[PDB]
Every structure is written in structure tokens, then in C-alpha cells.
Symmetry: C4
Subunit: 467 residues, 4 copies
Amino acid sequence: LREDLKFYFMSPCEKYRARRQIPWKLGLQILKIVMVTTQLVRFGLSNQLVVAFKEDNTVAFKHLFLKGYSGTDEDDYSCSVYTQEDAYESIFFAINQYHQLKDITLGTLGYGENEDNRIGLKVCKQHYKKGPSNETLNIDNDVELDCVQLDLQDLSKKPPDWKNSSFFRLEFYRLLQVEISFHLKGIDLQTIHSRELPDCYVFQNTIIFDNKAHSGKIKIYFDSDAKIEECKDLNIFGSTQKNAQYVLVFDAFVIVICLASLILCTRSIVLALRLRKRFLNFFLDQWEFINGWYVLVIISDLMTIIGSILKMEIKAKNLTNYDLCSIFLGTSTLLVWVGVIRYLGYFQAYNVLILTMQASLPKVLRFCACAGMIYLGYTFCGWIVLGPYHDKFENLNTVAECLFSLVNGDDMFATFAQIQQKSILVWLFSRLYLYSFISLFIYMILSLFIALITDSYDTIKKFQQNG
Amino acid sequence: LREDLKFYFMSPCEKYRARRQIPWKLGLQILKIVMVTTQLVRFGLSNQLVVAFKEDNTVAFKHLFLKGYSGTDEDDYSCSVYTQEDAYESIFFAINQYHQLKDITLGTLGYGENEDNRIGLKVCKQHYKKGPSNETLNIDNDVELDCVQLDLQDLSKKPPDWKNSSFFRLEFYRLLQVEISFHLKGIDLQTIHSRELPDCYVFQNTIIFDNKAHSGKIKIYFDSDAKIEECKDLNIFGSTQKNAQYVLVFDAFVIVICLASLILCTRSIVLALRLRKRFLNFFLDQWEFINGWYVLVIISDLMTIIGSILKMEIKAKNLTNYDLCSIFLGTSTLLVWVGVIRYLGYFQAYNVLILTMQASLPKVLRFCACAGMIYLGYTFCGWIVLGPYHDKFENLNTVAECLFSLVNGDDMFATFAQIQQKSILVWLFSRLYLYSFISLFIYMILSLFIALITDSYDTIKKFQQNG
Amino acid sequence: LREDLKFYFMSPCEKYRARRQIPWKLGLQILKIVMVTTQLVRFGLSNQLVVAFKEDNTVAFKHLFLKGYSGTDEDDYSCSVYTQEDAYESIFFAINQYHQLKDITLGTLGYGENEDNRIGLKVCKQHYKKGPSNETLNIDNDVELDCVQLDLQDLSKKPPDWKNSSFFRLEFYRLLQVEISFHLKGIDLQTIHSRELPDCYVFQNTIIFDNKAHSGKIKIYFDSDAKIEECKDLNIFGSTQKNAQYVLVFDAFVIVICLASLILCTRSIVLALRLRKRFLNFFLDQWEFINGWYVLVIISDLMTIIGSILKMEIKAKNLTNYDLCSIFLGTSTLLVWVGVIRYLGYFQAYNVLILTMQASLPKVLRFCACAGMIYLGYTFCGWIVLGPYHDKFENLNTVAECLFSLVNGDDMFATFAQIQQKSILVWLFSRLYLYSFISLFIYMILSLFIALITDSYDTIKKFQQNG
Amino acid sequence: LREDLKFYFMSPCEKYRARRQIPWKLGLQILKIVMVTTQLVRFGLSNQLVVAFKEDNTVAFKHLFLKGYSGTDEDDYSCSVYTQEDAYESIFFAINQYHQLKDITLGTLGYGENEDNRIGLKVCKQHYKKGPSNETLNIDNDVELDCVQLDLQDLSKKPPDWKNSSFFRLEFYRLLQVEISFHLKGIDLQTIHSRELPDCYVFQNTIIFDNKAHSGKIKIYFDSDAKIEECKDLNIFGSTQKNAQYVLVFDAFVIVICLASLILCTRSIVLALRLRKRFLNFFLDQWEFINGWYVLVIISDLMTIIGSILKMEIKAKNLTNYDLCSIFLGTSTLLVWVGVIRYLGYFQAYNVLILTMQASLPKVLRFCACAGMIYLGYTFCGWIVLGPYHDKFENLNTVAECLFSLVNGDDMFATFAQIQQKSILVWLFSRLYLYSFISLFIYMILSLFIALITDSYDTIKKFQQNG
């Protein structure tokens, strides 16, 4: 029983000296790291190409349909117009470029059927109801909705009477929004060199001329949603795509091995907890017989299993919404590579470092509460005071990120210089605030982490040497 | 009496074990943090919308009335012109855009009455008195002031003779300033979806073509001052605004609870100081019976009270000048959230960290004097030497901010590279200066904070363990 | 024998007191540092001029032949076009500028003979074979190659029928690439003031209008390859270039002295290893008699020898591909200047610092494994999750560089702000990821280096003082 | 004698208790800091205005006379042209703008007499002598110099035959340089509001169209040299400037007090050195009786004296070349404010910090040699390898500044990303280089400063406590 406990608590390098104790339970993990990492790598390299094609097409559409687009968006919208004539020019430019698409596009593009199954362009208006521009406003608080369909045989009639229509009498003082929507077909023909059957895309596009604010500016949003659809009629010679089976079977293998690892870890947690029960019953050492790394391994395997299920679901139904699956697979890989530290601890001279890391969290995290109370106080004060006058302090989230950057010393001179001296009182308070915060956190609080970590090191070092 | 002193000096977790000692005095504070923080949050979320509307309108006005405005100002002024014809073009552009406002604005704008109660545009000139452009200047040191009113029925006469008037013979060698001023009305109609009565604004605008320097450049300043006025005649259906009462009553509650907390803290300071008098009289422990946190709490509550008074004053009189009120409320919230640390000290394992923080100021602040003498010396030397040749060293304030950034390691390579090699002597001195300063402060002085903080940690740790 | 071992293990300052022991073996090294450093300096100052001329000519060519070039490239290509007409305009612009080169260039340029020994311009197309723009694509997966030669007496015929040719019917839906290629001659006439014979260059230029992606954008690549050729017929009065002999003989001297130093070091390693054999045989001190600095010196000299051989080879055959030779010479110089620390250790008060540096690697490098496992986990997770949404996380290499920067605190606020809030799930994960990583590495792991280095210092300090 | 030594070695706070020992020797210094600092402040505030006027005029001239100037220079030159027609357009634009100056300037400008005492414009050419554009160059290695004078009555003749002159047949293949030079008069009329007599300026301007490189680009340099001259005939009513006397007399007072302080310090060094001689003779304590602060004070006063002499010289002769005087005054002020630390040491609890600072240089500076050998090795290797491929590594000075920034952690991610992957070998070496350097200096060497400073702190702390 003493030998049993010694065996249960030792390492595999020492356990191997038993005449039948081969380390296959470790071999499974050594397989698992490689299999999971290669699954992640192949998934990422596949995902990247689809993302690149979709975003390249989005940029090309922005250049084609937005007048005067400079190639870079504003903070959340592609471009803006401040003049009543510029809005008309942009609105008509988008329609005229849609009309001429076949003669100006460099891609494999074509027209797609719309919601009415027509090939055509739909544009809609939203005006506050009940038509001077002030002093007597007779508005009535709800929205008129108007829409019109512009088809190719309309937008082409040599005399484009559609510009002269009564629809486009916009009355910008009532106007909330103008929306232009259309469908396009594309092909990622780049893939043809592999002799795989090229896949089509269907792009659903909307251009939003948005002025909910009524603050003298119209914001132009461009949004593009792509579906894979199905090659309608591509007579391109070559072969179809079936590699999908090689993805599905590999995901099945990954799921199987992760389940096997989870079974092994749960079994090990059971046997050892029983041994503790045996130890408790034996005679009138620590209560925690469970190896902590098994919890991490179990979590890793569960997340890998569910993430692989999501990936198989996405591929089977031919989706491109990779957010949640990417999160599960990435976090699982993170925990798997963290779990490798379990095997460095056996070799000595890493052990004191690992023990220092493990022993330092219970005090670093306790320091973070005392520091966080002050950090929250400065977050609220900075947001309320410097917010109207400083780009970094616009909202509590950005204030928190800015202060966290300042604690680590990043981008500090710009933080001082970015606030204008329009109000001397607020500027003086800004200097007081910034000097106080930076001094308090960099020269004292940040160094207390150094103090704590250094002193936690010496205890473990002196414990290890004293024994 | 011994039990009394023990009770007076202990914690509420231990004090609760007395048969009648419920912690209501702490419950009041736990209410107060929440109430003050929610007051700050609601104030900020209200303030942000008004600021956003005013600044969006300012940007729209800059785009409308400034010729060739690029969307970003220069360092303190919107744009500048260097040519005699460009000044005329900008001056006439502003007037022509004002004339056509109804046909070019995307907002709810309209014309506002001016100082003479006319609807019109006022422009004024300031020329050095006493009319070649040099070698014989007959100037006489004081300013001619000329003004003219341009009304809509003047600026509209098909033949705009106002451009041909003798007023605009500017003689830029004598010219100090040309100022264009007008009033506009606006509505933040965005709010209408809440069925609150929309509020109007009145914008007072001035465009200043400023060349006091006479240095070959005219600086164009745009300034816009907004008042809330009063919806003149908006027949928009819906309801008026009364929520203001919900703000006033909530501020009243906040003031009441802050006064209650202040009363409790002052009472506690009195009773305890008397106990010290009793202790002094008792027999032939430390002189400081007063809990230091009460001073912070009293200051916090006083600032909250006066800030809430200012907020109620602003809302009652319908102002938008939030600077001082924001300062009081933000600093009060900062101190309130700092005061939470009082309650972490009871739980142990935060106590050594709090004691280290409290014990480290009396030596960090004493080090700051010895460091500050050197820092001041470098500030003066950098300002006098590198100031004409380096954008960061233009004035003592910016020199101080730059050096404080350099001590923390920020934006260092740009600091070296930003000075041109026009003069080799000054460049060599700049390298000597920057290497000396950065070495002295980063590798020695900055690390002395680490030394001080780490060693202050060990005293408290060894005091706590030794007892 | 005891005196022998004492002599063998001491320093030259003490060894000099023997009646015949002059330090010539150190004099050779003191010569070697200077000779190698001056070789590097002269090589770099020569290389820089050729690189500057070639790159200045490349920039001038980009301005001449690329329509609307702004002076700065995009991330890997000079400029791009998104419209079917812009591609034609750029393609014809390049040819027209080539036709008019004699009248628009500011340099000493001239036309160079092409592959067919003609003076002329070659342009080629690559179209997917087998000619609507979709729904029925009859492509057949391999490439048509077409080329045509445009000579000066063609591109000049007053009626430039070459624009009307059937060649330029591009059919951009099939188009892979259009390539324009030509030769130019130049002279670095700047050198003439030295009365050295000026050298010619031959520039081989290719302009690639590349749209392999078919993603609605054509990428324009400009590449220029320069050869030295040979002054064809420059009647400029002066003298030819022969200094090359002064380079060759100096390289020969450097090789000779480096071989001598290597011989001395290998001889010293032999004698001392024998002494250890003698010490082993003497009686029933440490096994490592070899001085570690000799290994560094031998490596330095070998790399210097082979690098100088490569430099002589380059100069003899008149190449300009300096990559590998620069690597050998630079690394050799790095190791040579590192080897100087050998001589600071003799003077005391540097010895404890050198011993601390030497004693700290065996634990810093062991900590790097435990830290690297976590760092790899975060690299994979960041690449898979934030990659589609963040410019810094596009690929594993850039993720590794970004995380390594973040550990050192660089460019942190931009790292937070650069990811858009398009997807709330990914944004929340990004905040979790960034706060966790930055906290874990800056406040704990980075400070463990401080702990390790500080404690390694005290052991050596206390060992040195105790003896 | 024992009391004498005690008096000589104590502090003024204790020395004051002698019945006649008033601290006037300290009062002189307390006066001196204020007087020197105010001299520096007044000098800087005066210098700044003249610099601002001169540079504002320079920017206005750049906008007036350079075609298409964008408002920001290139790295050392205002703008560049790459096409043979652009050079002609810029050259003629400068002359035409000079011709029309009276009608386009916004300043008080006027024409100034040239070297021939004419009012006129001089332009000069420099062509390699001995007139195809290659394959047969008949150049002869020295420079033709041609010049022509364009006067106002020439540049005005309605038919400006000067453009058609044979002078402007530039032959850009031989051309080295074209230079345009002219004189202007200006007035800083801004000062008139003080009723001081406004001062004139004379601007000497040169525009250099420089293509020494012959690398396909012409660089356009603009240089402007301003002299104060003397108001020629300004009939502006007011008063002349005499405050200059208030500057001269104040500088005289500063010189007098600095000489007095130097006399006192030298006298104190003499008396104390004699006392040491007395102490040596007294009987069979440390050799260094001299107070170290006196050396700093003497240096400060000498530099202040010579700097004030230079300032008086500059003002008397009406110069604007402030470089050397600014250096002396700034360094003197730096040392004066450093000398204040002498008086903080008396108050205790600063003494241990000052002693730690003084005791830490003899080991930080010794560590800097061992670190500097490695730093030099990396400087040479980086310059030779990454120099052709990285903007930060162009030359040894910039390499040194970049590496010094990297040691302090600044601008690191850009340092990785700024090198293109054109050559995979150099890119791989760049990653090896950057990771090795950053790891070695940040995680080990930089932390050794923390170790040294922290341990130097504890010795002084334990010495001070043990006594």
C-alpha cells in the first residue's frame, strides 16, 4: 500500500522501472497534441482563403459603387457627404455603376436574382411623415416607407427617365435613410489550378445613406453578405470537390482520441480519489490526491470535441460563420499547449520555476483587487472629465483600455498631447490626473508585482534547498 | 473601558458579535457607492448626447463654410491661406454658402436673428490706421474698425453688387483681422423617436481670418456657440419633456444620503477623539485615534454634495457648461471607489499589501524631490537648447511632459530622430542630452523605486510574520 | 608543474612578470579587432553607394512608367486598379512613356537591347484558354500565352496603330497577367568628380499587371534588375578604376591574420588539453581546462575568412548580391567585439558582472521553455480567433512578433483598438485574450526574470566576498 | 582644532548655533539660483519670438515660390520632380511668382537689393563641360558656370522674352544644378502694439534645383537667411527700442554674482585643503577634505559667466545665432539645479537616497562597458546586414539609436514589421538578430541594473541603521 501510494504519486520516468509499466497513457497525449495542432493549422489555412476572397470582393465593390472612395473606411462607415448635391451625386453614381457593371468590372461577376426573382435593383426611402424647413415643422413622428424596383430594361432605356422620377424628391429635412440593394454572382476561379471544381458565391449588397442623427452629415454604409450557393452551370473542365471526406474522417479521428483521453483522465481521477478514501480509512500527506492537470486536460478535450462537432456541422451545411468554432478550437489548443508544462516538471531545474508560478497567483490576484478599486475610480473620473475633450476617453471601455495601456507605459506622450487647451480648467485637471495616475501605478503598484514575484521566488528556492 | 477601546478599534465582522451591534453604519456606505456611481453614469450618458450633437453640427458648419476644408483642423485653427487671392476666395465663399444655405444643408437648419434683430450676416475689418507696401510706412499704431450688414434681400439681388463694394478693398499690409458672424437655428430631431418634445438650438457662429502675426499666413478660425433657447413653434405631435423632475428628485436623494454619511463620520470622529481624551486622562497605543478613512469619506461627500448642487443648477437653468460639475462629481466618485479598500483590509492577505502601499509613500515622495531637482534642470536645459529645433521641446510644459514620457520609456526613437542635423553642434548636444537623461533615469532612478518598494514589502512581511 | 598550471591558468598582466613572456599573442588580437572592423566599415561604405544608386533609379522608373504613382508602394506592390478602363489607361501609359523616354527623363538614361537583340518593348498576355461573363463559362483550365514586340519605329509611326491592334482585346474575365518588359542603360555619373572611370548599369525592367486572384483588383508590380555590364563608349576624360587591387590585397592581409589567430588558438587548445592529460596522470581543479573564449575566437576567424573569400569573389566577378557575404562579415564582427569582454575580466569589479552574466543563462533559458509553451498556446489561439479580424494576427509569424512585442509592453493600446466590434462574441474574446495574456506575462513572467537575475547576482557577490 | 574640524565638516543648520555664524554664504546661492533661472527664462521667451517670425516667413516663402508645395518637406529637401517638364514648370513658376510678389503676398514684404546693388533676380546653371544622351558621352569632367540677371523691367516687358532665351536650354544629362537667388525685406509689425519701434528683416533666399546624383530625380532645396539690418524709413508713430540696456545691466549683475560665488567656493576649497595639511601635520578621517559640490558649483558659475558674455555680445552686435550661448546657459542652469540636492541632504531621510545614488555610479558605469562591447557588436552587424533593407538601420548612428530604443522597449513591433520579405535569407537573419538582441538586453542585462541598484540600496540602508 505504501509502494502503491509511492507509485501513484511519482513520475512516469521512475514508474517505468516497474516490470510491466509502459508509458502508453502518456503516448496518447503525445499523439493528441500533434493531432489537435494539425487540425487547427489545416482549419486556419482553409478559413483564410475564403475570408480573403470575400474581403477582396468587398473592397472591390466599395471602389466600384461608392463615389470618391479613398480605399480606407471611416471609423464605422465607408464615407460621408455633407452637402445636399453630394448625396444626390453618390446615390445616382451607385445606380449608374450598377447599370454598367458588365463593362467596368475586372472580376468574374454577374447579376443575381433579387427578392422578387427579378434581375433588378431595389432602392427604398424612409421619411418622417407629414410633409419651410423649420419654425413650423408639421411632422408626425412615424415613418413613410417607399420603395421602387429598377430593372435593367428600365435603367437602360436610352432616356433614363428614372432620374427624373418623382421618387427622388428626397426632402432631406424629413429623410431618415435611403437604402440601395442588389445581388451579384461570383466565382473564386483562382482555385481552378488545382483542378478542383470552382465554387460560386452570391453577394447580397446594401448601401445605406444614413442620417438618423440629422446632424448635417449623411453616413454611407456598405455591407456585403456572401453565400456559397452552388455552381449553377460552370462547363470548366476538371474534377469536382470530395476532399471534404478527408476532413470529416480526420475530425472523427480527433474526436475519438479526445474522448479516449477524457476517459483515461476521468478513470485516473476515480482510482486516485478511492486511494484517498483508502488512505483516510487506513489509520488515524494532503487531502488533495487529485492531480490538478487532469482538470485542464478534461476541459481541453471537451472543448476540442464540441469544436470539432461544430466544424463538421459547418462543413456539412457549407457555412462560413466560423466565430464560435474558432473560439472553441483555439482555446482548446491554448489549454493543450499549456498542459505540456506537466512534462517539464519532471526534469528538475524547471520545478522551482513552475512552483514559483503556481505559488504567485494567490497573491498577485489578491493585489489586483486593491489595485482594481483605484483603477475603477480613475476609470470613472477620467470618463466623466476628459471624455468630451479626449479621443481615448470617449467611453468606459476605451478609458479602461487606455489606463491599462498607461500602467504598462504604452503611448504616453500622445495621451498628454491629444487634449486641446480649449478649457484651462479641464486641461489643468488632465495634467493632475495623468501625473497622479502614472506615478501611482508605474512607480509603486507596478513595482509591487516585482517585489511579490521576487520574494515568492526566494521562498521556493529556499524551501527546495532546505528540503 | 478596555472592552470599549477594543470594540472601538476592531472590525465590524468582529463587532457584529455584540448582541445589538448590527452594521447599519456600513449599510449606508454600501448604498452610497451604488447611488453615487449611478448618478455619475446617468449624468455622463446624458451629457454625451448633447456634446455629440453640438460637435457634429460644428463639423458640418466647417465643411459648409470653409473653402477646401479637409475634415481635420490644424493645431489650433481650421485652415490657412498663404496667397492674396486665396483669402478673397475663402471670404467670398463663406458669404455665398451662407446665402445658399437652404439649398445645400442636409440638416434641420434655418436662419437666426442677429444682434440688430435682423436676419442677416455681419462682417467686420480691423486695419492699422493711416493708409507702397514698405520703405515708407505711414502707419499710426491704432486700429480702424469697419463693419457692414449683409441681409438676405441684399445678398440675393441678382446682381450681387456686394462683391463690388468698396468695403472689400482689404489692403492686407494693414489688415489685422476679418470677422464673419451669423446665427443659425437647429433641432436635435433624432430624439423624436422617444416622443419627447424635441429641443431647439441656436448657433452663434464667427469665422476669423486672423493674421496678427503678419508673417505671410492668414489663419482661419471657426467658432460655434450653441444655446438651447426654446422650441419656437414645432407642431411635431408627441409629448413634452418632464423627466427633469426624476433627475431633480434623484439628486435630492443623493444629497440627503451624502449628508447622512457625513454626519455619521463626523460623529464617529468626535466620539473617538473623546475616548482618546479619556485614555489620556486614565493613567500615566498611539495618539492617532482617528481613522484616516473618515477624512477621505468626508471629503468625498462634501464634493458630491456641491457637485450635485451644481448639476441641479445646470439642469434648472438649462446650461451646457459641464466642466466644473464634471470635475466635482468625477473626483468624488474617484475618492468613493478608493474608500472601498477600507473593507478589503478586514479579510487578511490584503492587509500586508495595503500596509505596504501606505508605508511606501513617505519614501517614494521623498525620493521624488531629489529626482525632481535633476528633472527640473533637464527641463530648463532641454527647453533652451532643443526648443528651436525639436517639436517636443517648444515650451516648458511640453518639455516636462516629454521628459516624463521618456522616464517611462515611451516614444523614444522618434525623440531622437525628430531633430534635424541642420546644426551639428546642437545635434551633438542633443545626443549627449538624450543619452545622459535616458540612462540616468531609466537604469538608475527608475530602478530605485523598485528597490524601495521591494524592501518596504519585506519589512511589513517580516513584521506581520514576527508580530 | 604547479607553477606551469598556475602560469597556464593566470592572466597576461601577471604572466608578463616572467622574464621572457611578452604578450604578443594578445597583440595579434588587438590588431585583429581593428583590421576586421575597418574591413567592415569600408565594405559598408562602398556597398551603400551602389544600393543608393540602384534604388534611386528604381523609384524614378516607378514615377515614370506607373500612372498616378503616389511615391509609396502598397504592402507588396506599387499600385492597383479596380476598373476595366483604368487597366487599359495604365497599360497604354507605360508604353507611351517608354516611347517618349528621351524627352522626359532627367537622368543619363538610354535604350538597351532586348532578348531578340532588338531595341524594343515586349508585352505578353496570359489568358485561361477557350473563350457571357458567367452562368456558362467554357474555360479549359490551361493558359494561352501571347506576346508581341513593339519597336521604336513601330511605336513612333505617327498613326500608332499598335493601340488599335487585336492584341489588346484583353477579356479580363479570362485574364491572368499582362507583362511589359524592357532594357535601359544608365551611368552613375556622380562618381566622375573623383576622376575614376564612371561605371555603367543595365536595367532589366518588368511591369506585371497581376490578377491571379480574380477578386476584382489588378495588382501592378514593378521590378528592376541592374547589372554593371561595362562602359560601352564613354569618352569622358579622366582615369580608369584600379583601387580594386587595394581592396584585394587588404582582404588578403585580413585572411592571413585571421588564419594566424586561428592557428594560435588551436595550438593553445592542444597544449592545455595535454596539460589536463598530464594533470590526470599526475595523481589520484576541474575537467574543463579549455578556455571557452577560444571557441568564440575560432568561430569568429572562420566566418571572417569565408566572408572575405566571398567578398573577393564578388568584387572579382563584379556582382552586387551582398546578402550572404554581409551576413558572414557582420556576424564575425559581432563575435569579435563580444570577445573583447575576455580582457575586461582581468581588471576586477567587472568580474562579478561577467560571472553573473555567465551564471544566469542556465536558468533564464530554462525558464524560457515553460514560458514558451504558454506563448505557443496563445500564438495558436490568437491566430485562429483574431486573425480574420485584426491586422496584427494575420499569420503565425506576425502573431508571434505581436505577442513578443506585447510582453515587452510595446504598441499596446493600438492592439486593443485595432479590432472592430463587428462581431460581439469575437470582440469579447479579444478582450479576455488580451487582458489575460498581458497580465500573465508582464506582471508575473517578466518579473520572474528580474527575480532570477537579482538572486543570481547575490550568489556571485556573496561567493566573491566569502571566497 | 577638533571643534574646528567638526565645524568645517558639519552642516549650516548646526553651524548656525555659533554666536556669529549667519548663513550668508548660503544666501548668495539662494539668490543665484533665482537670478540664473530668470535670466534663462527671459532669454528663452525673447529668442522664441524671433525664431517664430523667421520660420513663419520661411514657410510662407516655400508656399509662394515652390510649385505644388504640400506644406511639409521631404527628409532634407522641400520637394522633388521626376520629369523633364516638371523641372521647367517649377523653375519658371519661381520666377513668375517673384515677378508678381507685390500682388500675391499677405505680408509686409518688399524687394531687396542684390549683390550687384540692383533690384533683381539672379539664376545660375552648372553643367558638366563639353556638350546623343549616351553610348558616346563626350564629357570632360569640369563644370561650366553660367549666370544671368533678371531685373523687374526685364521680367515685366509684356513679351517676357526671358523664357525664350537661349539660357534655359538646360540639357539635363549634363546638368548639375540650377540656383535662383533673391533678396526680400520684411517687418515684424506684430510688435507695434507695444509701441516699440518695429524691427526690419532682410531675407536672402536661394532655391537649388539639385541633381548631383543624376539618379532620375531633381531635389529642390529652399534656404532663407535673415538679417536684422535697420528700419530704413518706417514713419510708424511710437517709440524706439532701448530696453536693451535693461538686458545688459541685468547680465552684468548675473556675471557679478556668479563671480562672487566662484570666489567664495575657491576660497572654501583653499581653507579646507590647508586644514587637511594641518591635519596631516598634527599627528601620526579621509584624505578628501574637499566638498565635491564645490567643483560642480565652480563649473556652473564659469559656464554662466561665459554664456552671459556671449549673450551680451549677441545683443550688442544684433545677431540671431543663439546655438553656443544657449548651450552654455542651459548646461549651467542644469548644473545649478542639480546643485540644489546639496541642501536636501541635511534634512535626513533623503540622505540614504542620495548616498545610494552616489554609490551606484561606480558599478552601473562599469557594467556599461561589458554591455557596450555587445552593443557595439550588434550595432556593426545590424548596420551591415539590415541596412540595405530597413529604414532604421541605414547608418551606424541610427542603428545605435534604434538599438538603444529597443533596449528600453520602444517602437518594437514596427522594428520587426518594417523589413520586407524580398530576400528570405536576410529576413530570417533579421528575426534571429532581433529576438536574440531583445531577449539578451531586456530580460537579462536591463534587469541587472535593477539587481545592482536594489543591492546598493540595502548596503547603505544597513550601513545607516548599523552606524
